[PDB]
Design a protein around this nucleic acid. Structure first.
Ligand SMILES: [Mg+2]
Ligand SMILES: [Zn+2]
Lengths: 136, 62, 101, 213
RNA sequence: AAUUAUUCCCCAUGAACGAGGAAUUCCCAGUAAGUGCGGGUCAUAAGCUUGCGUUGAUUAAGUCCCUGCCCUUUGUACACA
RNA sequence: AAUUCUUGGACCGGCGCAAGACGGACCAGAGCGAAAGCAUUUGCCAAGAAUGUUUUCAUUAAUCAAGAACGAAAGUCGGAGGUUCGAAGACGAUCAGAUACCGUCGUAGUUCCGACCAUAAACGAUGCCGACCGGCGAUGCGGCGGCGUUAUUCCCAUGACCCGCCGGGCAGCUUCCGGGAAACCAAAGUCUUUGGGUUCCGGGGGGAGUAUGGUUGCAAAGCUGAAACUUAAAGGAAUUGA
């Protein structure tokens, strides 16, 4: 529980992987390596209803618990790696992306550098749903 | 945060669901040049004063 | 009766154009039949920018943008109001709508 | 009922002598409990650092991958692994009404390291051009791509890895290709999109500690 | 002609009701509301209605969110639609 | 929402490995091909339209019964493969019911090699060859002439722009050429002022692409293809309503 960095100026950086699907949100802090995990609070751990796992609210709760949990270990600032589902599926991030990123900045952390890391394929395998799509 | 005075310079358009908020261009009495857009309840006139609790946030123009 | 000259599509002298999966459905539409749209968006919406402009470690780091190209099938395009129905005269107008602000 | 972060030593990370800001940050490890060792589990961690943070303050769109190939003592020693342009940059460059020319060469340094470099270049629209398009014919494209490969190979092949990174810190390779292809078709947004690492020589320490001052 | 009290007067009897759930109405200036006075019905006769003055405001000078109705474009194998 | 997956650590983050698909953005009313169709790099092999030509042969040509080559997808037989997706299936929902749309799995298939199959809204719903008949601005390939800008600094000479011209090609806008039932069309024009050449093919709607024979195929099925009977309409474009 002791990052031996200087009390005055030294910022200890983590990196927060915000995987935001359209029916879940993840907020997951790691080393600059990306190997050693510190926190992972999902949208679904906080709220107990299936329809609001992908909420701005649930993502706001998740980022708040992550912010509080990582402040104790002594992670001061965070780099950001945002992503939607990707592959064959959507490449627009979920509605929890904005509220989560906002929430762990309202909660007194520092924001380093942000970038999209969605798995964008060269050209991909056949997408789920028939030739005639998802008819409803 | 210190409470700051924004002065209405030109009333633009009416907004809200039931046409209830006047959206107005304000010119800051503090900084010479900074002019932002704010949604305001009640009746507002061209050339009077508002007391903003925050002098950074801005309302979405239509 | 003949409604379009270019049969609702921008194919003239091919025979075959490879199909694309719609971004709302997974419906197969030809590459040129599809209503295409290029959304260049700020990662942080409108007000979040101000909170992340102050809680940033750096000095005027121009926070990045989000580039997403979307292909809609005609039904998905009309349903989402990306396009709308038009007059017999206005149908022929190919100049895209003005984006002044 | 075991606090899992009680047994965690923090380790300072060090970048090689080629960059201005030496230390990248800190790294977590578990105390040597049993047979598996802290330093051995810590060896071979890949750090993706933006060149803005790696230097003092510059371009933030170029990133360098760095491998902790050895640990000396309370200090991870990283070494050049690879390179990649950011998604935002690559997506911003690729726009319609022009020709995108892509090359890749599999070339080896004087020391063991065998890289795979990917170059990219877009046809520039002239200052008085009224034609919308500004496309390159197929033979003009593959004459450009042949010249891309010829420079990319020459620049790396003849000198060692310390000097090829010194070339990738600016974009001397991309500026050299861009000026070279002015006669065939004027390109503009020319970079070395990506650098990959396929083979390393069998690890040395004296060769690492020359790169670490 | 008053019991199933027409109405009115005098003494006595002293019920719920402590500002009102879902839902919903009318209304912007001498207007809302409080207040009483006349006309109608009328042998008897106003808790109604139709007019009159007296006292006299808060809020708003906007919109298509709600409920309605109205238009233009578009589609149709409907035309006692 | 549930079916399903997971403290025998799923989902998430990191580093490696293997497999089989596919070639994003650049990618356009752009290109090529007889049509179906065709997109990562490089090499090899043969072909091809257009332009250029004061070369050659000198009617060798146009369209075509018979006969013949190629022919998306699905389907069939044998071999290799099986990542994704997924007819039938199995369940979970929804509903009055749901043998469906929505969900979780999932077999044939989806991919390659060698043999069949020969149909598609296989579409421009528009045979091929030739002539004449308006305008305008772009666009792709080839040639020609021309201020100037730019890269080779050393500029001759090559590329990149700039402004026109000529020939083929994918298209576009415009008009009382003219045609048409109109929609619309530089062809769907040059048609009662009716004839340039030639192949295929339609004759009110159903029965019906049905029966029967013959033929091709392993099968599915393809090609050719009626009649009795039934009926006063079915239909095409455009207008006003609802
Ligand atoms: Mg076709
Ligand atoms: Zn769709």
């Amino acid at each position: 529980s002791l990052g031996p960095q200087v009390a005055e100026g030294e910022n200890v950086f983590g990196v927060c992987h915000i995987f935001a699907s359209f029916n879940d949100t993840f907020v997951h802090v790691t080393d600059l390596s990306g190997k050693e995990t510190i926190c992972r609070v999902t949208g679904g751990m906080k709220v107990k209803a299936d329809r609001d796992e992908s909420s701005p609210y649930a993502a706001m709760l998740a980022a708040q618990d992550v912010a509080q949990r990582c402040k104790e270990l002594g992670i001061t600032a965070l780099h950001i790696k945002l992503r939607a589902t990707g592959g064959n599926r959507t490449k627009t991030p979920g509605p929890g992306a904005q509220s989560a990123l906002r929430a762990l900045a309202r909660s007194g952390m520092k924001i380093g550098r942000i970038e999209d890391v969605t798995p964008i394929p060269s050209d991909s395998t056949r997408r789920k749903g028939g030739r005639r799509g998802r008819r409803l | 945060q210190p409470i700051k005075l924004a002065r209405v310079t030109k009333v633009l358009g009416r907004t809200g669901s039931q046409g209830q908020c006047t959206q107005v261009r304000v010119e800051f009495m503090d900084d010479t040049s900074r002019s932002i857009i704010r949604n305001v309840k009640g009746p507002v006139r061209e050339g009077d004063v508002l007391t903003l609790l925050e002098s950074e946030r801005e309302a979405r123009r239509l | 009766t003949k409604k379009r000259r270019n049969n609702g599509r921008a194919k003239k002298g091919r025979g075959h154009v490879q199909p694309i999966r719609c971004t709302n459905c997974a419906r197969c539409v030809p590459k040129d039949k599809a209503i295409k749209k290029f959304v260049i968006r700020n990662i942080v919406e409108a007000a979040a920018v101000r909170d992340i402009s102050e809680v940033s470690v750096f000095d005027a780091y121009v926070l990045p943008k989000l580039y997403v190209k979307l292909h809609y099938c005609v039904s998905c395009a009309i349903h989402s109001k990306v396009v709308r129905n038009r007059s017999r005269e206005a149908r022929k107008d190919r100049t895209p709508p003005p984006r002044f602000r | 009922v075991v606090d899992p972060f009680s047994k965690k030593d923090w380790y300072d990370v060090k970048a090689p002598a080629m960059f201005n800001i030496r230390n990248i940050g800190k790294t977590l490890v578990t105390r040597t409990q049993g047979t598996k060792i802290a330093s051995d589990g810590l060896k071979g961690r890949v750090f993706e650092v933006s060149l803005a943070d790696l230097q003092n303050d510059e371009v933030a769109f170029r990133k360098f991958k760095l491998i902790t190939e050895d640990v000396q003592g309370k200090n991870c020693l990283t070494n050049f692994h690879g390179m990649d342009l950011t998604r935002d940059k690559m997506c911003s460059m690729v726009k319609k009404w022009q020709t995108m020319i892509e090359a890749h060469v599999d070339v080896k340094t004087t020391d063991g390291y065998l890289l795979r470099l990917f170059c990219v270049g877009f046809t520039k629209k002239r200052n008085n051009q009224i034609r919308k398009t500004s496309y390159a014919q197929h033979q003009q494209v593959r004459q450009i791509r042949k010249k891309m490969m010829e420079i990319m190979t020459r620049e790396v092949q003849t000198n060692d890895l310390k000097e090829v990174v010194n070339k990738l810190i600016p974009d001397s390779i991309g500026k050299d290709i861009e000026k070279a292809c002015q006669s065939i078709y004027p390109l503009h947004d020319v970079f070395v999109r990506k650098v990959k690492m396929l083979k390393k020589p069998k690890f040395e320490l004296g060769k690492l500690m020359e790169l670490h001052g």
